[PDB]
């Protein structure tokens, strides 16, 4: 389902922004 | 379910972006 | 509810990105 | 309700990111 | 509808972030 | 419909943000 | 949008069930 | 918006069905 | 997608229930 | 939230229809 | 996903009510 | 969450309505 795909993408986005914010 | 996971990730995204903005 | 939390988080994200864009 | 608020915030986010991309 | 507006905004967001990444 | 478009756009956003975080 | 159409149908469904219950 | 209207209509539907079931 | 299918089914249900109520 | 209200009403509707069917 | 399940159930509900209305 | 509860309730409603139709 789409909501499952959206949740997965947002987990990746959150991780990327965690790396950016710490850098 | 998925909606709660979405909400959780967006809360984390908001904290990271507030840190970046500061 | 989840939709209210999502809306609140996006309001915060918009606020932060406005600050970032403004120099 | 929340869905309309989500739409409004994402519109603001889109404008801020266009500003950042242009700046 | 709101979902249509959300989808359109996310297309703009994707386009801007592609430009930023490049 | 719209939810699938949203998922597709978020996959693209996730890719661009991973690229940004990696430099 | 679909959500608007769904709300319209549920208003019709609600009225039909009112007629059944009160009939 | 639409989700709140859907909820209101479903509350009415539940009330009518409670009358029928009762 | 699924939301459009839901709207289509609810329009059908509304018509069927109106016929039942008129009977 | 709207979804919580919708879920609550649908639980009521399902119970009423169980009573009707039984 | 849940939305796919909801659509499937409403397809079944529509068929059941159509059969009742036609009878 | 709520969407899964909505799905479960509609599955129950569908079984009950099929029983009534039968």
Author numbering:
A (entry chain F), C (entry chain A), D (entry chain C), F (entry chain B), G (entry chain H), I (entry chain I), ...: 1 to 23
B (entry chain D), E (entry chain E), H (entry chain J), J (entry chain G), L (entry chain L): 1 to 22
What did the article's authors report about this structure?
α-Helical barrels (αHBs) are a subset of CCs in which five or more α-helices assemble to generate central solvent-accessible channels along the superhelical axis. Here, we target new assemblies, namely, A3B3 heterohexamer α-helical barrels. These designs are based on pairs of sequences with three heptad repeats (abcdefg), programmed with a = Leu, d = Ile, e = Ala, and g = Ser, and b = c = Glu to make the acidic (A) chains and b = c = Lys in the basic (B) chains. Thus, we set out to design a heterohexameric, A3B3-type αHB, for which the individual helices were unfolded in solution and coassembled when mixed.
Peptides starting at g (g-register) form a parallel 6-helix barrel in solution and in an X-ray crystal structure, whereas the b- and c-register peptides form an antiparallel complex. AUC showed that both CC-Hex2-AB-3-b and -g assemble into monodisperse hexamers. Concentration-dependent CD experiments confirmed A3:B3 stoichiometry, and both bound DPH with low μM affinities. CC-Hex2-AB-3-g showed reduced fluorescence when the substituted amino acids were positioned at the same terminus (N- + N-), suggesting an assembly with a parallel helix orientation. The 1.9 Å resolution structure revealed a parallel heterohexameric coiled-coil barrel with alternating A and B chains, which is completely consistent with the solution-phase data. Indeed, these were near-superposable with the X-ray crystal structure of CC-Hex2-AB-3-g (Cα-RMSD = 0.52 Å). Moreover, at 5.6 Å, the Z-shift for the -g peptide is a whole α-helical turn (5.4 Å). Reasoning that larger Z-shifts lead to larger helical overhangs and less helix–helix contacts in the assembled CCs, it stands to reason that the antiparallel arrangement for the g-register peptide would be the least stable of these and less stable than the observed parallel structure. One of these, CC-Hex2-AB-3-g, has all-parallel helices, as is confirmed by solution-phase spectroscopic data and an X-ray peptide crystal structure. Similarly, while CC-Hex2-AB-3-g forms a parallel A3B3 αHB, the antiparallel tetramer, ap-CC-Tet, also has a g-register but with bar-magnet charge patterning to drive the antiparallel state.
